């Protein structure tokens, strides 16, 4: 299910920083970004329409860590909702539990947040959840149980939370590690760069 | 004097072991008469409709290439019936069977 | 087939004479009245109808006749014996 491989090769493959190597350290420049995705990365591709659709889809997926059948299930869930499909799809991607744990700063990278959810540490509404694909309902409270609280791995990785944008739609206590979930995020608030329209194009055909 | 042990005493075991071409089949077929009930490739068990007790039988193929049945089913049977012909006499089959039966 | 509930077989054998024999004698009385229809004697027809009426009502009572067959017999046979008379 999980990739568990070259998480920094994917950032060179898409060109943009996928935040898979976020970490305690800052922007690395240790892998020759944008100029070497692989062995023949010096070639300039033709880069057609289906090409940019597939690159955008795999970019959003390797940001969010979602497999293809699972993301197709998210698209099928977002297609039957109201409003528009493009905002609803990114809202369902943000509604994952490991993404909420990542936005709280409880862990440096996304796989660390997925491991923190999976190892019976992340607890929402008094009920411990192991599945990282937990659809977070509005008006919930997420925290860490006392037997797994602050064994330093949440601690220094919380300092990275002092360097992030710290978005509006969720609030962290940062004294007892008790987060608080709020209303659904607007499209003009989440990362301002990814394109949902190419994903709609690829899953519409 | 419970009848359970009194008919435990009425259950006995004789299999049969012998030389090749000795007559296992004929004597078992004729003990079938006595209770109103290549060569040698099977094993047969006869319980019995016998009058006094109910003594079981257990046949075995008698050869050297055969009879690896009887190395583990002479352990099953308490007693032992030997059948020896006079033209054959005491041969290596009988010596192997006595090497089996002296261990128990 | 070997079954503990084979008793309903031979007991139905115990049925298939006796009740049917009653049905037998029932219809012979009915046929007797038809003999009167072939005789032309209205008094003998009335006597045969009075002879067959309580036994066919008793056979309608005992579950053999479903009280509409025997009603049909009484109806059309009464129609015949008062058309003849």
């Amino acid at each position: 299910a999980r990739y568990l491989g070259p998480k920094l090769k994917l950032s060179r493959r898409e060109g943009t920083d996928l935040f898979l190597k976020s970490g305690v350290r800052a922007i690395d420049t240790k892998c020759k970004i944008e100029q070497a995705p692989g062995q023949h990365g010096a070639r300039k591709p033709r880069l057609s329409d289906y090409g940019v659709q597939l690159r955008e889809k795999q970019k959003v997926r390797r940001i969010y860590g979602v497999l293809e059948r699972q993301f197709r299930n998210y698209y099928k869930e977002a297609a039957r909702l109201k409003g528009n499909t493009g905002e609803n799809l990114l809202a369902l991607l943000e509604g994952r539990l490991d993404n909420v744990v990542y936005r709280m700063g409880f862990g440096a990278t996304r796989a660390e947040a997925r491991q923190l959810v999976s190892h019976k540490a992340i607890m929402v509404n008094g009920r411990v959840v192991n599945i990282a694909s937990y659809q977070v309902s509005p008006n919930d409270v997420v925290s860490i149980r006392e037997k797994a609280k602050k064994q330093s791995r949440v601690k220094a990785a919380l300092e990275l939370a002092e360097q992030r944008e710290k978005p509006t739609w969720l609030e962290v206590d940062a004294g007892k590690m008790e987060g608080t979930f709020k209303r659904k995020p607007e499209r003009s608030d989440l990362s301002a760069d990814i394109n949902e329209h190419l994903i709609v194009e690829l899953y519409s055909k | 004097l419970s009848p359970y042990l009194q008919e435990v005493a009425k259950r006995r075991t004789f299999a049969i072991i012998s030389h090749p071409d000795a007559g296992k089949t004929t004597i078992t077929e004729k003990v079938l008469l006595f209770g109103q009930a290549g060569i040698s490739i099977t094993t047969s068990v006869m319980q019995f409709p016998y009058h006094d007790c109910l003594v079981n039988l257990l046949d075995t193929p008698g050869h050297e290439d055969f009879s690896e049945d009887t190395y583990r089913t002479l352990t099953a049977v308490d007693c032992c019936l030997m059948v020896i012909d006079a033209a054959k006499g005491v041969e290596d089959r009988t010596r192997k069977l006595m090497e089996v039966t002296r261990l128990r | 087939n070997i079954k503990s509930a084979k008793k309903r077989a031979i007991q139905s054998e115990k049925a298939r004479k006796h009740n049917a024999s009653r049905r037998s004698m029932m219809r012979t009385f009915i046929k007797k009245v038809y003999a009167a229809i072939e005789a032309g004697d209205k008094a003998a027809a009335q006597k045969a109808f009075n002879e067959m009426q309580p036994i066919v009502d008793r056979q309608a009572a005992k579950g053999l006749i479903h009280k509409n067959k025997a009603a049909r017999h009484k109806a059309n046979l009464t129609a015949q014996i008062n058309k003849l008379a």
Binding site: - | T13, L32, A37, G38, D65, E68, D69, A76 | -
Partner: protein
């Protein structure tokens, strides 16, 4: 006719038999009927393969629930055949000191012990090491499945242990004796129709069965991947073509929780 009086007068009560703890007498409970042979059965429409037992201790029950000790499972067995005058008679219980016949489907091997909770073993299985005769090469090659099933049915027995190499042909019939005409005659049954006439093919010495402990036999599988062979009962011996290869196998040091299966 004079033998019967001697059979009555001379033979004693059935003796106790040795376990790992002590001898179990013929007055106790916890039925000690382990399986002796899995005999080469005559097949009317089914196999059941056989179960001869040692029920000397304990009087039978019709709805008794046996316990497989080597797999440690509570197995409910209500069907038990009595051998009245050779014919496999009806479902009957008896008095202890008799030998049954049960209905097994690839579950119980030779010597699998039975109690009602005494989880111990006997001192049996005097079975030997085979002498590898030739092959199976599938004359009239239609419908392989009668030998891929029905000889595996014979592979659990003490006489026959079928060896499957990786190359999916040339399957070795195990014999401990010399006369393999038994299986050749047994190939003419209701579920046996392939002939497989014999010739001379040299495979030398018995395939010493060995299944080592974890984390260590994986590289032993990997380094000689063309030199493995599946066995009757999903085993891998080594492969036996010569004594020198067995000396190299002993030089390779396969530390093992050893069980002979023979």
């Amino acid at each position: 006719d004079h033998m019967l009086d001697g059979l009555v007068e001379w033979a004693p009560a059935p003796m106790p038999r040795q376990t790992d703890t002590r001898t179990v007498e013929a007055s106790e409970d916890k039925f000690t009927g382990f399986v002796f042979k899995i005999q080469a059965n005559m097949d009317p429409k089914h196999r059941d393969r056989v179960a001869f037992m040692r029920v000397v201790s304990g009087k039978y029950e019709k709805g008794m629930k046996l316990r497989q000790v080597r797999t440690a499972k509570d197995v409910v067995i209500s069907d038990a055949l009595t051998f009245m005058a050779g014919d496999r008679s009806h479902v009957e219980e008896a008095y202890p000191g008799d030998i049954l016949g049960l209905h097994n489907h690839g579950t119980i091997q030779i010597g699998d012990t039975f109690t009602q909770g005494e989880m111990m073993k006997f001192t049996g299985i005097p079975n030997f090491a085979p002498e590898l005769f030739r092959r199976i090469r599938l004359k009239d090659p239609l419908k392989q499945k009668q030998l891929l099933k029905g000889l595996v049915q014979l592979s659990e027995e003490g006489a026959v242990q079928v060896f499957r190499p990786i190359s999916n042909n040339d399957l070795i019939v195990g014999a401990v004796g010399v006369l393999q005409f038994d299986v050749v005659v047994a190939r003419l049954k209701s579920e046996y129709n392939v002939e497989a006439v014999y010739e001379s093919v040299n495979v030398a010495t018995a395939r010493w069965v060995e299944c080592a402990d974890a984390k260590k036999f994986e590289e032993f599988k990997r380094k000689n991947e063309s030199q493995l062979a599946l066995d009757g009962g999903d085993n891998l011996a080594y492969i036996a073509t010569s004594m020198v290869n067995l000396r190299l196998a002993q030089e390779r040091y396969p530390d093992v929780q050893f069980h002979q299966t023979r």
